[PDB]
Write a protein that holds these residues in place. Structure first.
Motif, short mmCIF file in Angstrom:
data_model
loop_
_atom_site.label_atom_id
_atom_site.label_comp_id
_atom_site.label_asym_id
_atom_site.label_seq_id
_atom_site.Cartn_x
_atom_site.Cartn_y
_atom_site.Cartn_z
N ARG A 1 0.82 -1.21 0.00
CA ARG A 1 0.00 0.00 0.00
C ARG A 1 0.86 1.28 0.00
NH1 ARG A 1 -5.36 0.31 3.91
NH2 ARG A 1 -5.62 -1.82 3.12
N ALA A 2 2.04 1.23 0.61
CA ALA A 2 2.95 2.37 0.58
C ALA A 2 3.41 2.66 -0.84
CB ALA A 2 4.14 2.11 1.48
N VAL A 3 3.64 1.60 -1.61
CA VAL A 3 4.06 1.77 -3.00
C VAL A 3 2.89 2.19 -3.88
CG1 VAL A 3 5.05 0.64 -5.03
CG2 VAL A 3 5.97 0.16 -2.74
N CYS A 4 1.72 1.63 -3.62
CA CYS A 4 0.54 1.96 -4.40
C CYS A 4 -0.69 1.91 -3.51
CB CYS A 4 0.41 0.97 -5.55
SG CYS A 4 -0.56 1.56 -6.91
N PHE B 1 -3.63 -2.98 -9.11
CA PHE B 1 -3.16 -2.88 -7.72
C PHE B 1 -1.72 -2.39 -7.63
CE2 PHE B 1 -6.11 -6.68 -6.53
CZ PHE B 1 -7.22 -5.87 -6.66
N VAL B 2 -0.88 -2.79 -8.59
CA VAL B 2 0.56 -2.53 -8.46
C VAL B 2 1.09 -1.31 -9.18
CG1 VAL B 2 1.20 -4.93 -7.87
CG2 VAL B 2 1.24 -4.19 -10.29
N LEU B 3 0.42 -0.89 -10.24
CA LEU B 3 0.88 0.26 -11.03
C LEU B 3 0.04 1.48 -10.69
CD1 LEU B 3 2.80 1.08 -13.40
CD2 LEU B 3 0.80 0.82 -14.89
N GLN B 4 0.69 2.55 -10.22
CA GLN B 4 -0.06 3.75 -9.85
C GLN B 4 -0.96 4.23 -10.98
OE1 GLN B 4 -1.77 5.86 -7.46
NE2 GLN B 4 0.23 5.29 -6.60
N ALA B 5 -0.44 4.26 -12.20
CA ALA B 5 -1.24 4.74 -13.32
C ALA B 5 -2.48 3.88 -13.53
CB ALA B 5 -0.42 4.80 -14.60
#
Ligand SMILES: N[C@@H](Cc1ccc(O)cc1)P(=O)(O)C[C@H](CC(=O)O)C(=O)O
Ligand SMILES: [Zn+2]
Ligand SMILES: [Zn+2]
Length: 393
Positions: A216-219, A248-252
């Motif tokens: 969650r800190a990363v995304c 879930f993993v890529l901000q975009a």
């Protein structure tokens, strides 16, 4: 040799234990379990992320096969038994390639003989129909983890993708965790709310897992794990198995999906509406805003941060293959794992770090669950408690 060549060598010694693959649900939906129509001894790349040859190419040495069923339909227990039966049938059909595994020792036995250890994990507490005896029956049939919720709350646990309900685990929810600890079933905290994660970590006397969750800190997305929860894993002894789901993993992709969902609501549709009319609206959105594409690097970013916070002994991989429609470039199907391992080598991960990530952590955690279960089974009998007794009518 190249990092990719080295990755394949490393995986031959210590292969991937993947935490969550939805092949059974895919077979249910595509062909209603007509296994000849999707024979995994043949090339199924047109239809599925998974088949036997691609698993071998990918360096998968053990698989938790998901026995997921829908929480929004009746008859979840019956459907779960059908999913378990599908896994049993796959194992029986492919004895050269697959070996049933119920224990950590079975996983090692499979690895020694070059077969893929095949385990089962239930995906959502609705699979037990509020019944501790049903939980025990699932364990007897071979289920070795249960995700406490899927996308919706159940009566005794809160989901990350629903509104607050009971505030984490209810009293009966804690009883479910206690019984899982006594049976030796791993508590899976993918899908659950952060409150539920903390309550489960307070209650559990065994290492817990996240079968398919990232950082969650990363995304920032509720399906990912907060740092404060990752920090508790060392003490708990459990592990977080990173997932590949781009939204879930890529901000975009998180942002794109949020905007797509808003656009659906702007046209008067629920964001999950799958009618032809809703699909027209979504297609028009994608026409003006193409879907962003994740990469192996995206997933490695999650693992780097998870390693920093949780520690290398508390990580695994849970690809979510055949459970999600889109994949990162380089991780397009179950053959992709060596690409991730190669990226991690390039980022300086050691060979022993990687053997933990792929194989050793998962075996340690299942063994620990067995160990805790030995103690609890010797100490007391199974629980006879009901949800009415503990949570009220
Ligand atoms: N069991 C899958 C859901 C499913 C798939 C297909 C179907 O007909 C019904 C349910 P999942 O929970 O493993 C995938 C999900 C991400 C996504 O939706 O893409 C997540 O993990 O959070
Ligand atoms: Zn899931
Ligand atoms: Zn799933």
């Amino acid at each position: 040799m190249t990092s990719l060549e080295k990755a394949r060598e490393l995986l031959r010694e210590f292969p991937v234990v993947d935490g969550h693959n939805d092949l059974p649900w895919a077979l249910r939906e595509q062909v209603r379990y007509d296994l000849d129509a999707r024979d995994i001894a043949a090339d199924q790349s047109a239809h599925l992320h998974t088949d036997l040859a691609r698993l071998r190419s990918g360096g998968v040495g053990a698989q938790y096969w998901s026995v997921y069923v829908r929480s929004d339909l009746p008859g979840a227990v019956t459907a779960t038994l059908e999913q378990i039966d599908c896994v049993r049938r796959l194992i029986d059909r492919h004895p050269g390639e697959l070996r049933a595994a119920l224990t950590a020792a079975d996983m090692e036995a499979a690895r020694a003989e070059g077969r893929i250890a095949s385990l089962m994990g239930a995906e959502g507490g609705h699979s037990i129909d509020n019944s501790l005896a049903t939980l025990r029956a699932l364990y007897a049939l071979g289920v070795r983890y249960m995700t406490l919720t899927h996308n919706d709350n159940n009566a005794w646990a809160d989901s990350a993708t629903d509104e607050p309900g009971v505030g984490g685990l209810s009293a009966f929810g804690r009883e479910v965790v206690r019984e899982m600890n006594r049976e030796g079933m791993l508590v899976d905290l993918s899908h659950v709310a952060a409150t539920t994660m903390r309550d489960a970590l307070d209650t559990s006397t065994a290492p817990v897992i996240f079968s398919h969750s990232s950082s969650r800190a990363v995304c920032d997305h509720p399906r990912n794990i907060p740092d404060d929860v990752l920090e508790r894993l060392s003490a708990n002894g459990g592990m977080a198995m990173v997932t590949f789901v781009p939204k879930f993993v890529l901000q975009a992709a998180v942002d794109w999906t949020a905007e797509a969902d808003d656009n659906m609501r702007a046209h008067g549709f629920h964001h999950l509406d799958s009618s032809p009319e809703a699909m027209k609206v979504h297609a028009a959105f994608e026409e003006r805003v193409p879907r962003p594409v994740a990469t192996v690097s995206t997933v490695a970013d999650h693992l780097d941060h998870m390693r920093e916070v949780a520690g290398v002994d508390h990580l695994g991989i849970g690809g979510d293959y055949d459970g999600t429609p889109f994949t990162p470039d380089g991780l397009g199907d179950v053959s992709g794992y060596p690409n991730l391992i190669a990226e991690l080598l390039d980022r300086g991960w050691s060979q022993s770090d990687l053997a933990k990530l792929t194989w050793k952590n998962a075996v340690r955690v299942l063994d620990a669950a067995e160990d805790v279960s030995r103690g609890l089974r010797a100490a007391r009998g199974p629980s006879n408690a009901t949800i009415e007794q503990l949570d009220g009518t």
